[PDB]
Design an enzyme around this catalytic site. Structure first.
Site, mmCIF file in Angstrom:
data_model
loop_
_atom_site.group_PDB
_atom_site.id
_atom_site.type_symbol
_atom_site.label_atom_id
_atom_site.label_comp_id
_atom_site.label_asym_id
_atom_site.label_seq_id
_atom_site.Cartn_x
_atom_site.Cartn_y
_atom_site.Cartn_z
ATOM 1 N N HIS A 57 6.546 1.569 1.937
ATOM 2 C CA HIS A 57 5.698 2.563 2.600
ATOM 3 C C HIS A 57 5.231 2.123 3.983
ATOM 4 O O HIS A 57 4.720 2.950 4.733
ATOM 5 C CB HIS A 57 4.509 2.974 1.721
ATOM 6 N N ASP A 113 8.397 0.441 -4.341
ATOM 7 C CA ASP A 113 7.820 0.333 -2.995
ATOM 8 C C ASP A 113 8.145 -0.970 -2.288
ATOM 9 O O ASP A 113 7.273 -1.530 -1.624
ATOM 10 C CB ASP A 113 6.292 0.540 -3.039
ATOM 11 N N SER A 194 -0.884 -4.049 2.239
ATOM 12 C CA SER A 194 0.363 -3.640 1.609
ATOM 13 C C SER A 194 1.502 -4.562 1.964
ATOM 14 O O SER A 194 1.579 -5.063 3.082
ATOM 15 C CB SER A 194 0.742 -2.244 2.024
HETATM 16 C C1 LIG Z 1 0.290 0.517 2.919
HETATM 17 C C2 LIG Z 1 -0.774 -0.416 2.272
HETATM 18 O O1 LIG Z 1 -1.388 -1.115 3.348
HETATM 19 C C3 LIG Z 1 -1.856 0.263 1.427
HETATM 20 C C4 LIG Z 1 -2.703 -0.755 0.660
HETATM 21 C C5 LIG Z 1 -3.998 -0.124 0.051
HETATM 22 C C6 LIG Z 1 -4.774 -1.142 -0.850
HETATM 23 C C7 LIG Z 1 -6.089 -0.498 -1.361
HETATM 24 N N1 LIG Z 1 -6.742 -1.333 -2.338
HETATM 25 N N2 LIG Z 1 -1.225 1.200 0.506
HETATM 26 S S1 LIG Z 1 -1.670 2.792 0.453
HETATM 27 O O2 LIG Z 1 -1.545 3.269 -0.885
HETATM 28 O O3 LIG Z 1 -3.034 2.942 0.923
HETATM 29 C C8 LIG Z 1 -0.554 3.715 1.449
HETATM 30 C C9 LIG Z 1 0.616 4.204 0.903
HETATM 31 C C10 LIG Z 1 1.479 4.943 1.703
HETATM 32 C C11 LIG Z 1 1.147 5.171 3.048
HETATM 33 C C12 LIG Z 1 2.123 5.996 3.926
HETATM 34 C C13 LIG Z 1 -0.012 4.700 3.584
HETATM 35 C C14 LIG Z 1 -0.895 3.949 2.766
HETATM 36 CL CL LIG Z 2 2.998 5.677 -1.402
#
Ligand SMILES: *C[C@@](*)(O)[C@H](CCCCN)NS(=O)(=O)c1ccc(C)cc1
Ligand SMILES: [Cl-]
Ligand SMILES: *C[C@@](*)(O)[C@H](CCCCN)NS(=O)(=O)c1ccc(C)cc1
Ligand SMILES: [Ca+2]
Ligand SMILES: [Ca+2]
Ligand SMILES: [Cl-]
Lengths: 264, 265
Positions: A57, A113, A194
């Protein structure tokens, strides 16, 4: 950079058992903008290939985008800021001077992912990198440790001291993800984290962060996150460009888990 | 198919004002397995091109996978099952007999979780399709409507009767997503619903479902979802392969919003 104050600087004592795999994790930019986390992974040939695991992602999925990414090593606060303190929530003093530019995409697949890149530039011994082991066995663990760049800020560590669970993303029916539960007042993960690894107690990558409900203000079951599993990514989409197996075990040794490899 | 009982069959009276755009929405399979939702969108040339908007996370992003996808039209329960009833939570009687196979990827971008496909096969008039309008303006709306295939089961409708909000995914800092709040006892969305449209009150696509905390048991703020915005996807990653604008407005008319196009027109 700035991230939630409940997070734990890697240099804190909480990092005492992870001084090797801390050196596997990096922050990176996408088209110039600080973007996500990834980490260096060993392969069964122990050959220092710059295999760099991150999240699909995050969008590092084309040759063009990979070609201009910048990877920043050893970006962390110089001192342990007390978790929960104003200091911990403040801009850190990390350096972004140790970097490298450019990669190719080896594989990517949405379901777990994952993206596996191979960085263009050979490891600079001066950077003192570590290539982490991995474990692709189909099982839960009694605890786990995250090392990550929340908000793509200075590197942090978060510990889970309860069992993982296997599920789909966000607890849906499935087996693609490891659900990791954080401690009630411990470190969590944030956007930017992420692609960061989750490590078994033996310090082997089990997956990389997809997302989840955690934040420093999260309570109960919401103080948790989901990692796309190495187990799942290993076979992935059934082709070399959609799975890990061809890269992490190119020789076909049949390894179910391997240990890390140091720069030394 | 089977989905949460709180959901609302499209044939229910709750669909009375959406009988056109209901016909834009389809379920599809990925490498043979029922997978996600997408929908047909009109473009400024009103030419029936089979532009089919879905979610990037559904993984319909390579030529191989796009080539073998199967799109199923008009898959819905024949009768209105009472929302909340055991019947609504049971396997429906929808048909998967009206399908077409294959597409190409026109654009995809992770940040607003969008993929725009163009289906290979021209619309079969017998399928009675509708190409929905869209609205790329930078704004919230006073309510919105989702039409979707939760669990890739029979088509459902979910209404929001409060204002949307603009944010990042999961309420993070950002402007890439529309945050839509569902009614306390109304329909929601579920895995499989991804890629489904959210419509403005004027029935124009504003975005497609990325994900969110909602489920039939979710309450309050958790009974909500996030849609990658057309506004954001319009410019996307700044190239024709990463944005909507070249496809939905190939002529460069400058349209900020357009209405739909029916099979009968
Ligand atoms: C992309 C990642 O940096 C985040 C991590 C969030 C952790 C929260 N505890 N993933 S996400 O789910 O927020 C996400 C997924 C898809 C996209 C396009 C943006 C953000
Ligand atoms: Cl996602
Ligand atoms: C992919 C979509 O069908 C779901 C929709 C869930 C809606 C819940 N109210 N999106 S998701 O966030 O659950 C998701 C995102 C990424 C991946 C790889 C799987 C599922
Ligand atoms: Ca299912
Ligand atoms: Ca163009
Ligand atoms: Cl940020």
């Amino acid at each position: 950079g700035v991230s939630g104050s409940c997070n734990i600087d890697v240099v804190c004592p909480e990092g005492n058992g992870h001084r090797d795999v801390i050196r596997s994790v990096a922050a990176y930019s996408k088209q110039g903008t600080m973007w996500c986390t990834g980490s260096l992974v060993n392969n069964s040939a122990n050959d220092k290939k710059m295999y760099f695991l991150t999240a699909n992602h995050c969008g590092m999925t084309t040759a063009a985008i990979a070609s201009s990414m910048v990877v920043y090593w050893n970006y962390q606060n110089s001192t342990c800021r007390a978790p929960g303190s104003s200091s911990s929530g403040a801009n850190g003093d990390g350096s972004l001077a140790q970097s490298q530019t450019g990669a190719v995409v080896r594989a990517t697949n949405a379901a777990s992912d994952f993206t596996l890149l191979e960085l263009n530039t050979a490891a600079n011994p001066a950077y003192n990198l570590f290539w982490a082991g991995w474990d692709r066995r189909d099982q839960n663990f009694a605890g786990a440790t995250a090392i990550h760049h929340p908000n793509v800020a200075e590197k942090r560590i978060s510990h889970s001291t309860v069992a993982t669970e296997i599920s789909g993303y966000n607890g849906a029916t499935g087996t693609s993800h490891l659900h990791v539960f954080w401690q009630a007042s411990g470190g969590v993960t944030e956007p930017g984290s992420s692609g960061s690894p989750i490590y078994s107690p033996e310090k082997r990558v089990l997956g990389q962060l997809h997302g989840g409900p955690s934040s420093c203000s999260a309570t109960g079951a919401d103080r948790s996150d989901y990692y796309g599993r190495v187990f799942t990514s290993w076979t992935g989409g059934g082709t070399s460009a959609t799975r890990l197996s061809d890269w992490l075990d190119a020789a076909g040794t049949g390894a179910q888990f391997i240990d890390g490899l140091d720069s030394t």
